RNA sequence: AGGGGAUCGAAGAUGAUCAGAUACCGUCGUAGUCUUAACCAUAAACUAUGCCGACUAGGGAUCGGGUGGUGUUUUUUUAAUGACCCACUCGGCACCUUACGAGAAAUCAAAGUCUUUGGGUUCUGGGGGGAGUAUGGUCGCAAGGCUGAAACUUAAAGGAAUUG
């Protein structure tokens, strides 16, 4: 039946927003319907910074941290653990944590 | 738009009466509702209601004493012959002994038992009980 | 014998409460079936339903049994109870006990003038549980009980002699119609008439004027 | 079948019929 | 009427200022606005003691109308008011309930903690939404100790007071236990104060 | 692996609430009293009931715990429950509110000692 | 509360609610008696100018209209008439 | 509300609306079209004499499993061809 | 309710919620009746005389039992100024 | 019809997979995707909730406008003045609790004020198939769109929730 209050999307009062492809299967989905993840990770491993500091002529280094927005279709997201099917009463829980 | 101020009047009273409010406000305060309120007023269904005459037909406030239970309008105002007035009441009145149906009439605006008594009919305005 | 637990039972055990209507005048909650046994010895029953209903489990269709029983003598009191029990006969006794607990009165009215004793209901009443809506329309004296074979017996127990029932929704379901009849039948006292407009001194609690008699800790 | 391909197959049938119907006409 | 013996002397008014019983939280529901005087420039609302102290007299009159002190339930659900309620029962019958209400205490006679109270007092409707819901089945008048933003459903006598002030919750108990005692009987005129400071209803850690 | 099941718990909570004065801290001593005040069919169970007896009773003496009730604490609590003075703090020992309490007095036509202290606007 | 004196609400209510949802739809705007040191004629100016204002006697600008009440000029002496 | 023209002077609109919507009835539509009279083996008749031409065994619509003892008959009144059941046990040995 | 010769044939006159004058049901287990004592000299409430108030379960459901009581108390002198008619 | 023609890509071709794979996967690749001027007039064109009007409960944010503060904040330290915070209000997209109320329920602050049945008004549905089919008309370059049955056939499809 009607599974969700907002059908699957953060779309209220437009009629159309935009198509966006997925970073895994390349499936065109609305941008708001996508699973947005601000993947904030370093170029290197956590244990990796020690050798960089040892192997740099810069004693005081900056530790760069890359940014990339993985726009995910729910077909890929569920398979990729990114989201989990939740309880019907717990479906309303919109809190990120 | 407000196709019938009488309809929106009796609608508003029922909405607030079901809530149990001691006072209800009606707009745009025509006389047909004012004449309608008089009929309830002599029948105790309604309390002291204050008419506020602003220069744009104003509005009213009605200190209903939580006394009636359901007052409604029959829109549009079907005509009725005296031989069939009882036929109308049966479909609208919870009981014969109590509850009235309001008939507009060139004689005036009155509930059905007096309209029957004085023996004149007209078009149906609404029902009160 | 019967040792009461509620104050109502203990106060009834004093014998002070002898009027059933006092329970309903003050809307006293009921928890013990013996209360109506003592207060209304002249009380009969009749079973409407014997329905098998099963939970589909790992074991299989473990068929529980739900039965509905009406109770109330024709003096103006009716109580309708539903209960689900595995044994067929225990369901009858389990259902009636809650039915005694759920007893409700009736306002018996007159169709027209105030002649004689009351015969019918005093107003047309709203009742709807599930999709079923039963509308109890007052009828003139002697017109008979015009209703469903199941529902009309509920009215016969209630002691009203003439009424018109306008059934709506899936009236084929018997449990809803019985409850819809029960919801509608008890709406008589929820409906106000001008003869009732007169204020009353709001009679005080017999739970306090018959007063603390038992539970003497 | 979806509502689509049931409709699509009747649409193809309708296309075939009109050519045949007009072919004599 | 009510005699002239119901004034708030400046000695216990200054106690109330220290008690912090009159300043509420930062928002108020529309059913608690008659018990509000104004707001402060930092965005906080205020209770006026004129309302609650009168309303607190009304609640006692209903409790005094109870003939049996032992069939009136006093509820607490948090250590913020546990000590007070038990020690509110330390001045009258007041069959108390500590912490968990064990739902099914008013219906469901089979339970060992079953009761048939003729009235209930609640420290907090929020921490005790359940027992108030229980009064809906067995026709119990409910007197609640209400914040300005506390939901006020199914409660007959709302007492506007601070449930966040330690010195407030026991003091509202300190009063509420007082005039019922005064109306209980064998309490002398109201000329002189308690034996010691009222700080004794107030839970301390540990 | 030595968790005490329900039946030993239910037996133990029974004895604590009936013979709390008669318990002793020593396990062997109160093991023996379980013999004639309780009906334990198996000796091993009789040990275990006494086993949880010591656990509960060591806890109860160091402050009462919820789930336990007996006459002694009922009366001992009742001793705190009869603390009532001749008079109380709320008294005429010195209404101190904003101006609304001045309007509070003349409403019904009564005389009160009005001593108002303004509340911040 | 369902028991309210809508007839005579406190002065807090009126300035709180909307003009058209009051009991009587009375204007809340006003006209201002305003003077400039360089003129000898009075000038009545509506609260929300809605257009440029100039004294007849001396050519000047008084208050430039905005969406609401106009921001008056710097050397402008206003009073409520 | 109620989605129908209620006004005192809209009896035509209500009438035409009902005239259109009555056609969704099944018994109503069959009478107006007269499909029983025109496209049906019986010309609005209760019975019709005929002549059996062959005896047919018909497999019974499952769940039942049985031969259903039916006879093909020609209707005299229209000439059509229908098959008919023979009631009672036997009664094909009683018909030729 | 009475017949053509008085002698009221009625199981009981129902209560009216004094807050809203609505008729009290026969199963309204939320509906409650509160008793208030009458006080006398030196601030002592006397058992024996007591004013009664009826509240319908609907009013309690809406959470208006409190303010409606204040409307039912300001008139009868229990409290001086608690229910502000104008605000 | 003309221009444009990078990417992707129906069709098509290929190499894998399976038993078959003319499908999913990979590579290439046409129409197409873009534009100028016309056509068609359709979608799960959906918030599956016609449009207008009033009323009924509270709240919070957000967008846009407006109002007030000797509030914060902008070179000058109440000066040449936007942003912000406060108390609001109007309108909007919506949102959280509660169900008074409704509903078959899921759920709905509107799907509420509907058996206590009537504010005005438009359209649509009458078991499922057949079937949005045949025919007929009209529109269209066509694709097809709109209107739209019947015969015959079945006792059920279907909705929402419960348990397995």
mmCIF file with all atom_site columns, C-alpha atoms in Angstrom, chain B residues 63-105:
data_model
loop_
_atom_site.group_PDB
_atom_site.id
_atom_site.type_symbol
_atom_site.label_atom_id
_atom_site.label_alt_id
_atom_site.label_comp_id
_atom_site.label_asym_id
_atom_site.label_entity_id
_atom_site.label_seq_id
_atom_site.pdbx_PDB_ins_code
_atom_site.Cartn_x
_atom_site.Cartn_y
_atom_site.Cartn_z
_atom_site.occupancy
_atom_site.B_iso_or_equiv
_atom_site.pdbx_formal_charge
_atom_site.auth_seq_id
_atom_site.auth_comp_id
_atom_site.auth_asym_id
_atom_site.auth_atom_id
_atom_site.pdbx_PDB_model_num
ATOM 1  C CA . UNK B 1 63  ? -22.616 32.978 23.608 1.00 0.00 ? 63  UNK B CA 1
ATOM 2  C CA . UNK B 1 64  ? -24.170 29.562 23.117 1.00 0.00 ? 64  UNK B CA 1
ATOM 3  C CA . UNK B 1 65  ? -24.798 27.937 26.488 1.00 0.00 ? 65  UNK B CA 1
ATOM 4  C CA . UNK B 1 66  ? -23.887 24.490 25.163 1.00 0.00 ? 66  UNK B CA 1
ATOM 5  C CA . UNK B 1 67  ? -27.575 23.681 24.979 1.00 0.00 ? 67  UNK B CA 1
ATOM 6  C CA . UNK B 1 68  ? -28.476 22.488 21.483 1.00 0.00 ? 68  UNK B CA 1
ATOM 7  C CA . UNK B 1 69  ? -26.907 19.410 19.931 1.00 0.00 ? 69  UNK B CA 1
ATOM 8  C CA . UNK B 1 70  ? -27.247 19.753 16.142 1.00 0.00 ? 70  UNK B CA 1
ATOM 9  C CA . UNK B 1 71  ? -28.529 22.689 14.085 1.00 0.00 ? 71  UNK B CA 1
ATOM 10 C CA . UNK B 1 72  ? -28.277 22.395 10.321 1.00 0.00 ? 72  UNK B CA 1
ATOM 11 C CA . UNK B 1 73  ? -29.394 23.923 7.052  1.00 0.00 ? 73  UNK B CA 1
ATOM 12 C CA . UNK B 1 74  ? -31.311 22.383 4.171  1.00 0.00 ? 74  UNK B CA 1
ATOM 13 C CA . UNK B 1 75  ? -29.587 23.901 1.156  1.00 0.00 ? 75  UNK B CA 1
ATOM 14 C CA . UNK B 1 76  ? -31.014 24.679 -1.327 1.00 0.00 ? 76  UNK B CA 1
ATOM 15 C CA . UNK B 1 77  ? -34.277 25.890 0.208  1.00 0.00 ? 77  UNK B CA 1
ATOM 16 C CA . UNK B 1 78  ? -36.748 23.336 -1.082 1.00 0.00 ? 78  UNK B CA 1
ATOM 17 C CA . UNK B 1 79  ? -40.339 24.469 -1.174 1.00 0.00 ? 79  UNK B CA 1
ATOM 18 C CA . UNK B 1 80  ? -42.951 22.543 0.778  1.00 0.00 ? 80  UNK B CA 1
ATOM 19 C CA . UNK B 1 81  ? -46.727 22.189 0.856  1.00 0.00 ? 81  UNK B CA 1
ATOM 20 C CA . UNK B 1 82  ? -48.499 21.999 4.205  1.00 0.00 ? 82  UNK B CA 1
ATOM 21 C CA . UNK B 1 83  ? -49.733 18.490 3.444  1.00 0.00 ? 83  UNK B CA 1
ATOM 22 C CA . UNK B 1 84  ? -46.092 17.383 3.195  1.00 0.00 ? 84  UNK B CA 1
ATOM 23 C CA . UNK B 1 85  ? -44.498 19.354 6.045  1.00 0.00 ? 85  UNK B CA 1
ATOM 24 C CA . UNK B 1 86  ? -44.750 16.357 8.372  1.00 0.00 ? 86  UNK B CA 1
ATOM 25 C CA . UNK B 1 87  ? -43.083 14.263 5.667  1.00 0.00 ? 87  UNK B CA 1
ATOM 26 C CA . UNK B 1 88  ? -40.076 16.590 5.740  1.00 0.00 ? 88  UNK B CA 1
ATOM 27 C CA . UNK B 1 89  ? -39.805 16.581 9.537  1.00 0.00 ? 89  UNK B CA 1
ATOM 28 C CA . UNK B 1 90  ? -39.705 12.788 9.837  1.00 0.00 ? 90  UNK B CA 1
ATOM 29 C CA . UNK B 1 91  ? -36.588 12.666 7.665  1.00 0.00 ? 91  UNK B CA 1
ATOM 30 C CA . UNK B 1 92  ? -34.956 15.511 9.618  1.00 0.00 ? 92  UNK B CA 1
ATOM 31 C CA . UNK B 1 93  ? -36.250 15.436 13.182 1.00 0.00 ? 93  UNK B CA 1
ATOM 32 C CA . UNK B 1 94  ? -34.712 13.100 15.776 1.00 0.00 ? 94  UNK B CA 1
ATOM 33 C CA . UNK B 1 95  ? -38.147 13.107 17.386 1.00 0.00 ? 95  UNK B CA 1
ATOM 34 C CA . UNK B 1 96  ? -41.548 14.686 16.931 1.00 0.00 ? 96  UNK B CA 1
ATOM 35 C CA . UNK B 1 97  ? -41.798 16.017 20.482 1.00 0.00 ? 97  UNK B CA 1
ATOM 36 C CA . UNK B 1 98  ? -38.564 18.016 20.240 1.00 0.00 ? 98  UNK B CA 1
ATOM 37 C CA . UNK B 1 99  ? -36.536 19.493 17.411 1.00 0.00 ? 99  UNK B CA 1
ATOM 38 C CA . UNK B 1 100 ? -37.836 21.978 14.852 1.00 0.00 ? 100 UNK B CA 1
ATOM 39 C CA . UNK B 1 101 ? -37.491 22.680 11.135 1.00 0.00 ? 101 UNK B CA 1
ATOM 40 C CA . UNK B 1 102 ? -37.374 26.324 10.097 1.00 0.00 ? 102 UNK B CA 1
ATOM 41 C CA . UNK B 1 103 ? -39.632 27.525 7.283  1.00 0.00 ? 103 UNK B CA 1
ATOM 42 C CA . UNK B 1 104 ? -39.179 30.877 5.613  1.00 0.00 ? 104 UNK B CA 1
ATOM 43 C CA . UNK B 1 105 ? -42.576 32.334 4.837  1.00 0.00 ? 105 UNK B CA 1
#
